[PDB]
Amino acid sequence: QPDDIEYTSLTTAGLLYAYAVGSSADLAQQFCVGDNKYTPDDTNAPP
Amino acid sequence: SVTVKRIIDNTVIVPKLPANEDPVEYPADYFRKSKEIPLYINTTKSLSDLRGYVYQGLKSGNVSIIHVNSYLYGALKDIRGKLDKDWSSFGINIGKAGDTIGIFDLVSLKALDGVLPDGVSDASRTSADDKWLPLYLLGLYRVGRTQMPEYRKKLMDGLTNQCKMINEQFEPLVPEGRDIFDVWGNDSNYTKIVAAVDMFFHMFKKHECASFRYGTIVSRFKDCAALATFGHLCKITGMSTEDVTTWILNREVADEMVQMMLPGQEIDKADSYMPYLIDFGLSSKSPYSSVKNPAFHFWGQLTALLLRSTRARNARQPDDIEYTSLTTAGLLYAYAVGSSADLAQQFCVGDNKYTPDLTTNAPPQGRDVVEWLGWFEDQNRKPTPDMMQYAKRAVMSLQGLREKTIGKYAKSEFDK
Amino acid sequence: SVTVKRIIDNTVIVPKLPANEDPVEYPADYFRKSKEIPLYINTTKSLSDLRGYVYQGLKSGNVSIIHVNSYLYGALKDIRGKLDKDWSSFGINIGKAGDTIGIFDLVSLKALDGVLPDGVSDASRTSADDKWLPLYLLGLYRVGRTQMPEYRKKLMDGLTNQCKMINEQFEPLVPEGRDIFDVWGNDSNYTKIVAAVDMFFHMFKKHECASFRYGTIVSRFKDCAALATFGHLCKITGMSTEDVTTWILNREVADEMVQMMLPGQEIDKADSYMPYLIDFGLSSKSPYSSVKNPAFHFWGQLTALLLRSTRARNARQPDDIEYTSLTTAGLLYAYAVGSSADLAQQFCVGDNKYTPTNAPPQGRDVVEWLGWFEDQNRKPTPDMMQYAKRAVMSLQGLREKTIGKYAKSEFDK
Numbered sequence: 001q002p003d004d005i006e007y008t009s010l011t012t013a014g015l016l017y018a019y020a021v022g023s024s025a026d027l028a029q030q031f032c033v034g035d036n037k038y039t040p041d042d043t044n045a046p047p
Numbered sequence: 048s049v050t051v052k053r054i055i056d057n058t059v060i061v062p063k064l065p066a067n068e069d070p071v072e073y074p075a076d077y078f079r080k081s082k083e084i085p086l087y088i089n090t091t092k093s094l095s096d097l098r099g100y101v102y103q104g105l106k107s108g109n110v111s112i113i114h115v116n117s118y119l120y121g122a123l124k125d126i127r128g129k130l131d132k133d134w135s136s137f138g139i140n141i142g143k144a145g146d147t148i149g150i151f152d153l154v155s156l157k158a159l160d161g162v163l164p165d166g167v168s169d170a171s172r173t174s175a176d177d178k179w180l181p182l183y184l185l186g187l188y189r190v191g192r193t194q195m196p197e198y199r200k201k202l203m204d205g206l207t208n209q210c211k212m213i214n215e216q217f218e219p220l221v222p223e224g225r226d227i228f229d230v231w232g233n234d235s236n237y238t239k240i241v242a243a244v245d246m247f248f249h250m251f252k253k254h255e256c257a258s259f260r261y262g263t264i265v266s267r268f269k270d271c272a273a274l275a276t277f278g279h280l281c282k283i284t285g286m287s288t289e290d291v292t293t294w295i296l297n298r299e300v301a302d303e304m305v306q307m308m309l310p311g312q313e314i315d316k317a318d319s320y321m322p323y324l325i326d327f328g329l330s331s332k333s334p335y336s337s338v339k340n341p342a343f344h345f346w347g348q349l350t351a352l353l354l355r356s357t358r359a360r361n362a363r364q365p366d367d368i369e370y371t372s373l374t375t376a377g378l379l380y381a382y383a384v385g386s387s388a389d390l391a392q393q394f395c396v397g398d399n400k401y402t403p404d405l406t407t408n409a410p411p412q413g414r415d416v417v418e419w420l421g422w423f424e425d426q427n428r429k430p431t432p433d434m435m436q437y438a439k440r441a442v443m444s445l446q447g448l449r450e451k452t453i454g455k456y457a458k459s460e461f462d463k
Numbered sequence: 464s465v466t467v468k469r470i471i472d473n474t475v476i477v478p479k480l481p482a483n484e485d486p487v488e489y490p491a492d493y494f495r496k497s498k499e500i501p502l503y504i505n506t507t508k509s510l511s512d513l514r515g516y517v518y519q520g521l522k523s524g525n526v527s528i529i530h531v532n533s534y535l536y537g538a539l540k541d542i543r544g545k546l547d548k549d550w551s552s553f554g555i556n557i558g559k560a561g562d563t564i565g566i567f568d569l570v571s572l573k574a575l576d577g578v579l580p581d582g583v584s585d586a587s588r589t590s591a592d593d594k595w596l597p598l599y600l601l602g603l604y605r606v607g608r609t610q611m612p613e614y615r616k617k618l619m620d621g622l623t624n625q626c627k628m629i630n631e632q633f634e635p636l637v638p639e640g641r642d643i644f645d646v647w648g649n650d651s652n653y654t655k656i657v658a659a660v661d662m663f664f665h666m667f668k669k670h671e672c673a674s675f676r677y678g679t680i681v682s683r684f685k686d687c688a689a690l691a692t693f694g695h696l697c698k699i700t701g702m703s704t705e706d707v708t709t710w711i712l713n714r715e716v717a718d719e720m721v722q723m724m725l726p727g728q729e730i731d732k733a734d735s736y737m738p739y740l741i742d743f744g745l746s747s748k749s750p751y752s753s754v755k756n757p758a759f760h761f762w763g764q765l766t767a768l769l770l771r772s773t774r775a776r777n778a779r780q781p782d783d784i785e786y787t788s789l790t791t792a793g794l795l796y797a798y799a800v801g802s803s804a805d806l807a808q809q810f811c812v813g814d815n816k817y818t819p820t821n822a823p824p825q826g827r828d829v830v831e832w833l834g835w836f837e838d839q840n841r842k843p844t845p846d847m848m849q850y851a852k853r854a855v856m857s858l859q860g861l862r863e864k865t866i867g868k869y870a871k872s873e874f875d876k
Contacts, residue, residue: 025372030301285785355786388788393717400830
């Protein structure tokens with residue numbers, strides 16, 4: 001843990017990035033047999 | 048990839064990072080170059096002098112690896128074994144209709160001369176020989192693999208398998224951790240004898256001397272764990288090989304699964320060279336290793352753990368993979384398989400149950416990827432508290448978890 | 464073999480995985496080839512010299528297995544035993560109306576000559592012999608099977624069964640773990656004498672010398688546990704063999720049950736060769752083993768455990784089976800049998816009792832119960848989950864890797 005950096009803002013930013021990547025997984029079908037899933041159908045809820 | 052520009056001053060930046068390499072090497076794409084496997088046993092000097100050099104050289108840390116290879120060759124050219132069918136692999140014909148073949152029908156050459164002790168050595172020993180001395184030398188190859196104290200746990204394998212119509216006792220002295228006999232691993236020519244033995248007795252599974260496998264077996268599928276974990280995943284979920292494949296849900300696992308399934312390699316073959324791709328020196332980076340298949344290794348082992356596997360409890364957690372998305376995908380697949388059981392009547396007495404006669408948030412009825420993927424979109428692509436609870440029950444109440452296992456990862460992540 | 468294609472770039476991938484083999488070998492499909500069982504006792508040299516070679520060779524780790532076989536042969540050709548009915552198995556006629564037969568009426572040949580110590584050996588010993596020396600040699604075959612310290616637990620079996628009109632004491636020295644006499648297992652010809660003895664005294668169950676079974680018995684149904692667990696499941700649930708069969712609810716258990724029931728094998732037969740399929744060398748992979756019947760083994764043992772079995776507490780948990788679905792099915796079966804008891808008046812004195820949504824079926828019928836399970840979302844009800852907890856909580860002394868430890872860890876929260 002380096003000295004003389006800006007710990008609080010550096011960690012808030014880390015939290016956000018890790019939380020973004022963290023909750024919304026990649027996740028997409030990769031192989032099929034003529035039968036696949038086209039996904040794209042359909043405030044405080046995250047992106 | 049594209050163009051990244053720095054906003055404050057609108058300048059280009061070209062993000063790049065250090066190169067990485069060692070590509071895997073497939074077995075087939077090697078019988079393209081050569082068409083034989085060289086076994087260098089240079090020195091050939093008295094099948095009976097050798098018996099002694101080793102017999103004594105073994106009660107002290109200094110027996111030449113060059114001497115065992117030479118002894119082994121000599122005590123093993125039992126030209127035994129008769130082919131009922133035909134045997135062929137990678138173009139190399141190793142015997143046909145009816146022939147007899149011996150272990151070393153896998154390509155003998157010889158070389159240089161920096162030999163150890165003189166002429167007619169410690170000539171005390173008789174034809175104890177074949178009966179057991181080779182089985183011991185080969186035995187140690189295995190005891191040399193294992194790091195933990197499981198080693199002496201498995202060196203009693205040796206003792207009690209020797210007593211089979213011959214009975215002596217111990218031999219060496221110094222522990223292990225790779226020092227004494229467990230350096231034999233690195234001798235390109237020692238491993239080759241091991242592979243040849245194991246491959247040969249995997250064909251004539253019923254030979255009288257086939258007991259030799261009893262230390263030569265850890266050669267088969269050495270450095271090919273990804274394949275095994277795949278087979279385990281299939282057995283543990285009851286799914287077919289082609290259905291498991293469809294439940295792969297991440298770019299890098301799919302990349303790796305394609306890697307392992309490349310078509311010219313005889314993986315599904317009966318008795319081929321491919322299991323021994325590493326010890327015959329056909330490959331120096333196995334495409335089937337869990338080190339070269341990290342994402343698939345994590346996903347496959349994590350999934351099997353949630354589905355109640357015991358092996359998965361101790362598998363190793365690779366570095367530099369995408370843990371969060373890899374585990375979300377594992378959770379889904381294990382939850383699918385996990386809640387909707389197979390379950391169908393199998394036998395009857397003229398009286399059977401024809402089955403096919405909770406709305407939206409209730410999960411699919413089978414184990415199909417598309418149904419389940421769709422149900423997951425529906426749920427905000429975030430795990431429902433039930434499947435989160437399902438995971439908790441499977442990992443809570445495990446114990447004895449070693450540091451850095453996919454087991455400890457799983458408990459720490461799910462058992463709050 | 465349908466078609467898997469990779470969506471991102473629409474290419475074909477051909478999922479395949481390493482081959483596996485060793486098919487089982489049935490007993491019947493072996494008397495198709497040969498029609499006899501070779502017992503090689505090559506050396507035949509003095510029924511009385513041999514008595515000594517072994518008597519001494521036994522107070523030290525070096526007696527030749529070739530010498531015991533030869534001695535055993537010689538001390539055991541008591542041609543005793545008279546058939547009341549007929550005896551016949553697999554086409555092989557081994558005796559008919561009235562005959563007398565001996566143990567070795569199961570096919571003697573001889574061979575090579577790498578013999579040990581000379582001519583007229585340690586000739587101290589008399590006709591102690593038959594009376595007890597063979598019963599001891601055969602005894603050790605059994606003591607050689609067991610791994611744990613249960614071995615000496617069972618070697619006192621030997622001592623106290625010898626004292627029966629002869630009384631001596633110990634003999635060897637070195638422990639076991641497979642080293643001394645427990646290497647005798649591997650001698651194709653030793654096991655064959657064991658099987659022949661046990662099979663012969665399972666017919667003349669009342670012979671004076673039938674006490675020999677008292678170490679030769681672990682040969683019978685060696686490597687055939689699936690059959691025994693089946694019988695146990697039947698006894699433990701009170702159901703018939705045909706009814707238990709209908710409660711099989713998973714592809715792989717049904718596959719395996721079909722495997723064990725293949726019709727030309729004499730499993731249900733009185734005195735056949737089939738129990739000894741392994742030790743007579745009729746088979747080198749038993750179709751009836753629990754290793755070759757893992758799904759059935761788990762399901763059957765787990766179910767018997769929930770119904771209160773004690774054997775089931777220590778059975779081994781096979782790898783590479785489908786644990787979750789296998790246990791859900793077990794839960795259901797054990798819960799059905801478990802809550803609705805048989806229970807019917809059995810005796811009377813002119814005075815008897817003619818008996819006749821989310822509440823479960825009234826009997827033990829698969830269809831009623833399968834339907835009730837559909838009704839419940841194909842997920843176990845909290846009552847049956849609680850039923851399972853009561854049966855496994857309060858067990859103790861559970862060894863690692865038993866279907867017992869699996870069951871407590873899975874149900875006793």
